[PDB]
Amino acid sequence: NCGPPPTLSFAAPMDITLTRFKTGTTLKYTCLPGYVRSHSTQTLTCNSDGEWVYNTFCIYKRCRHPELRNGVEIKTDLSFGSQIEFCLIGSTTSRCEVQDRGVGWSHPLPQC
Amino acid sequence: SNCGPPPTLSFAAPMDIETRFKTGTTLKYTCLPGYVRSHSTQTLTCNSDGEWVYNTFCIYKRCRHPGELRNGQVEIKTDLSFGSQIEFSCSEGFFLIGSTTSRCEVQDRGVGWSHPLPQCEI
Amino acid sequence: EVTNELAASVWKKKVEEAKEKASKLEKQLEEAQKDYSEIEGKLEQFWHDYDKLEKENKEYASQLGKNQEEREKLELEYLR
Amino acid sequence: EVTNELAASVWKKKVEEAKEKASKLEKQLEEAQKDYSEIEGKLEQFWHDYDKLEKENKEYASQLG
Ligand SMILES: [K+]
């Protein structure tokens, strides 16, 4: 018998609120805002040994590509939670964040 | 009120291997080697106007980037997709050992480069 | 002589920088192509799952249609 | 081992080629990110069609058992 499911950073339960669980229980999960389904199923399963089996079935959504006239350093990537460093009027940085059923940049481009 | 033989498609092939077709006739297709599915509807359907209705449900597969050529340059003339060709060159003072060109071809249910990266050697 | 050493040291540090800027752009281009290939391969597999589901749907509606048609036939037969 | 003047003259040249390479690497990454935006869009459109199918599949199976 399984205990509470682990806390995933990319998904939350889809039809239950957060106890113990019978073997063979299959909880359906949904990708958190800012993530997209990367596997055909999105489930956590209680195995015969009382543990939860699952892989990573969501991945970061990616913002669109950021040109600054008279002046953009992508330090990592364009994925959810990443930051770009912007010549000097405006913001010096922008982050990929959740923006209305999708992702987007926190601030638009600055004025050089 | 009837469709003639279906058009020949360059990106897909008919799944069935008749000359007149009734309105509503649906023929299923699959993508050709070097192509990949881009839509849910892989079918041609006989429309009431006597013409086959279909979109382009297959698009080119894409070869991965060849890599950087030591002491040389890799020229991506067009793209990295099926059918496209890249050219190789070595820097001044180095000689090219191998192929000067490579093509994105069908390689085992996928796509790959015909020739590997050459060696630029002094 | 002292100026030449100072010039070489400056440009060596300059070339060390530009080598890192390219190396970081190279890895960023490599990871951006692997990530495309990740989705492209997942979609090719996912369409297979889509097709198996559509086949199930076509069979389901077929079994259902044959069931109501047989039920209507027996009811019409009993009425005769 | 080279002379300081000779080494600096080739480091200067190499810096020129690296600047040109980086400028090219940034057009290719731009085109790559734009490509990924498209393939990710194609993935979202798949789950849209797939979800419609599964809702229909679930309703079909419910009417049979
Ligand atoms: K579609």
Instruction: Give one DSSP letter per residue of C27-66, joined into a string.
Output: HHHHHHHHHHHHHHHHHHHHHHHHHHHHHHHHHHHHHHHH
The single-letter code of the amino acid at B51 is: E
A59 contact D CB<8A: no
Chain centroid to CA D60: 40
- C-alpha span between C34 and C39 (Å, rounded): 9
* Contact (CB<8Å) B40/C50: yes
C65-to-A74, C34, C51, C56, D56 alpha-carbon distances in Å = 58, 47, 21, 14, 15
Please tell me whether residues A69 and A43 are part of one structural domain.
no
Closest by CA to A96, choosing from A104, A88, A86, is: A104
Burial of B12 (0-12, 13-18, 19+ CB in 10 A): buried
Query: How many of the other CB atoms lie within 10 Å of CB of D39?
Result: 19
Counting the structural domains of chain B, the total is 2
How many C-alpha atoms does C31 have within 13 Å on its Cβ side?
Answer: 10
> How many whole angstroms from D42 Cα to the centroid of ligand 1?
8
Shortest distance between the Cα of A40 and any Cα of chain C, in A, equals 7
Q: Are B119 and B69 in contact (CB under 8 A)?
A: no
Last residue of a domain, one of B60, B76, B100: B60
* Contact (CB<8Å) A36/D40: yes
A37 contact D CB<8A: yes
Please tell me whether residues B54 and B69 are part of one structural domain.
no
Residues, beta carbon < 5 Å, ion ligand 1: B 39-40
Q: Are B95 and B102 in contact (CB under 8 A)?
A: no
Please tell me whether residues A55 and A65 are part of one structural domain.
no
Q: What is the resolution of this structure in A?
A: 2.7
Please tell me whether residues B8 and B51 are part of one structural domain.
yes
Per the structure, the complete domain to which residue B51 belongs is given by 1-60
Shortest distance between the Cα of B89 and any Cα of chain C, in A, equals 19
The residue with tokens 């085992």 is B108
Please tell me whether residues A45 and A79 are part of one structural domain.
no
> Which residue of C28, C31, C42 is in closest CB contact with A38?
C42
Q: Collect all residues with Cβ–Cβ distance below 8 Å to D48 and sequence separation of at least 6.
A: none
Closest by CA to B65, choosing from C29, A68, C77, A35, is: C29
- C-alpha span between A60 and A73 (Å, rounded): 20
A77 contact C CB<8A: yes
- C-alpha span between D4 and C15 (Å, rounded): 15
Method for structure elucidation: X-ray
> How many whole angstroms from D47 Cα to the centroid of ligand 1?
10
CATH of the domain at A3: 2.10.70.10
**Chains A and B, touching by 3 or more CB pairs within 8 angstroms:** no
Q: Which residues are paired to C58 by β-bridges?
A: none
Please tell me whether residues A49 and A94 are part of one structural domain.
no
* Contact (CB<8Å) D15/C14: yes
Q: Write the DSSP symbol of residue C8.
A: H
Closest by CA to C60, choosing from D64, B66, D55, is: D64
Please tell me whether residues B73 and B39 are part of one structural domain.
no
Q: Collect all residues with Cβ–Cβ distance below 8 Å to A93 and sequence separation of at least 6.
A: A83, A84, A85, A86, A106, A107
Instruction: Give one DSSP letter per residue of A25-94, joined into a string.
Output: -EEEEEEPTTEEE-SS--EEEE-TTS-EE----EEE-BPPP---TT--EESS-SBTT-EEE---BS-SEE
Chain C: touching chains (3 or more CB pairs < 8 Å): A, B, D
